[PDB]
Symmetry: C2
Subunit: 230 residues, 2 copies
C-alpha cells in the first residue's frame, strides 16, 4: 500500500485448536499496515475443535506470498500431516517466507512438510517424542527459535512470539505499544501449564487421556517420516 504491507498467513483447518490461531492473529493484526490471511483449501467456514466456526479468507492458490506463515495445532493436525496439498502449500510458502512459525502440534505439520530436518524445535508436551522422527532436534522450551523458524510449545505461545515478530518487523517500541494497547498481562491462577510444574496426579491424568491420540499421531508421524526418507 502507501507503506509496505507485511503478509501474514495462518493455516485454518478443520478441528484446529482455535485459540492457537486467534491469539497470534489478534496481536499481529494490530500491527501497522499488515494484511492477515486465514488460509484453507477454499475460503469459507471452517469448524474448530470446540465447534466454534471461523472463516477462511483465501484458498492456497490465491494466497499471496507470505512474509509470516503460522501453523496452529489441534486435533486436526493428524489429517493435515498427510494432506498432500496442504503440505505442498506450506513448503512453497516456507521456501521464501521471512518467518516460519507454529503452535503446539502445528510443528508436526512443519515436520511432515520436511521443514524441521536438523532444526531445533518444540511441540506440545504430550507429543514431544514425535519431533525426532521428523528430523528435529527436540527442545523443551516455551518458544524455540532456529534462524527464522519459531515453534511454540503451548496454546498461547503464538501470542508471545507474535510480540517478538512485531519487534523485528517494526521495532521494540511498536511491540511494546501493542502489548500496552491490548493490555496483555497474563497471570494464571494455577501453575499447571507444564508437566514439570503440574501435580503428578494431574500429569498422569493428562497422559492417560492423550494416549490414544498419541498412538494415532505416532503412526501418522512415522508414515510422514518414511515419505520424507524416500
Amino acid at each position: 500500500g502507501s507503506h509496505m504491507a507485511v503478509q501474514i498467513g495462518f493455516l485454518l483447518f478443520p478441528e484446529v485448536q482455535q485459540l492457537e490461531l486467534t491469539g497470534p492473529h489478534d496481536v499481529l493484526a494490530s500491527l501497522p499496515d499488515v494484511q492477515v490471511h486465514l488460509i484453507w483449501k477454499e475460503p469459507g467456514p471452517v469448524v474448530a475443535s470446540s465447534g466454534l466456526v471461523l472463516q477462511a479468507t483465501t484458498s492456497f492458490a490465491d494466497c499471496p506470498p507470505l512474509d509470516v506463515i503460522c501453523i496452529p495445532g489441534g486435533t486436526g493436525v493428524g489429517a493435515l500431516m498427510e494432506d498432500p496439498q496442504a503440505l505442498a502449500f506450506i513448503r512453497q510458502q516456507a521456501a521464501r517466507a521471512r518467518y516460519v512459525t507454529s503452535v503446539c502440534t502445528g510443528s508436526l505439520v512443519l515436520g511432515a512438510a520436511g521443514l524441521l530436518q536438523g532444526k531445533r524445535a518444540t511441540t506440545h508436551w504430550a507429543y514431544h517424542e514425535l519431533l525426532a522422527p521428523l528430523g528435529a532436534i527436540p527442545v523443551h522450551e516455551r518458544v524455540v527459535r532456529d534462524g527464522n523458524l519459531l515453534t511454540g510449545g503451548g496454546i498461547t505461545a503464538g501470542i508471545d512470539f507474535a510480540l517478538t515478530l512485531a519487534a523485528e518487523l517494526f521495532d521494540a517500541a511498536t511491540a511494546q505499544r501493542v502489548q500496552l494497547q491490548l493490555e496483555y498481562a497474563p497471570a494464571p491462577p494455577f501453575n499447571a501449564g507444564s508437566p514439570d510444574t503440574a501435580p503428578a496426579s494431574v500429569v498422569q491424568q493428562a497422559r492417560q487421556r492423550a494416549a490414544d491420540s498419541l498412538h494415532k499421531r505416532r503412526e501418522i508421524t512415522l508414515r510422514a517420516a518414511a515419505r520424507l526418507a524416500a
Copy 2:
C-alpha cells in the same frame, strides 16, 4: 444431559476484540459437559475489530438461561452501551447467572446495564475513569472479583479467570488438567502490559492514540449513567 450441562454464554457483537472472547471460550469449552453459546441479536456472521469473522450461535431470545455470562470488550462496546435490547438481555441473564464476567471495556457494558453499582470492578486501563460514573468502586487489579462478578482488565484476563471458574464449577484438579492439556504457560517477551511497567514513552504514545476513543466513550458513559439515575 447425562450430566449437568453448564450453560456458558459470550456476547458476540460487531467490532468485538476477538481474543477477549476466543481465549476464555477455548478454555471453558474444554470443560466437562458444558454448552457454550455465542450470543447476538441473531445467529450468523459477526465481524470482529480485526476483520476476523465469528459466527453467533443464538439470538438473545433463544439463548438458554446462562450459568456464566461473559461480555468481551473492543471498539464495539461504545455502541453496545446504548443498545437497549443488548442491555436488557444482559440484565435478564445477570439476574440469575451464577457468574457475571467481562473483559476489558466489556465491564463498561455491565456498567451501562446497571450491574456495577457499588461493586468493585476494573476495565481496560485506558478507560478506567469510566467506572466511577457507572457506580463501580474502581480497582486496579488484573481480575477484580466482587461476589459472583469477575471483571478482567486486559485482553487475556478471561483465559486466567476461566481457570478460576473451572475450579469452582468442577474442582481444582479439573482446572489444572485443562491448563496442562492446553499447555497454557504464558511468558511475554516484553513487560509493557501495564502502564506502570511499560516505558513512559510507550505509555504516552498509547494515551495519545486512545484519546479520541476515550472522549467518545466518556460521552456515551455519561449518557448511560444519566439513564440509570432516572
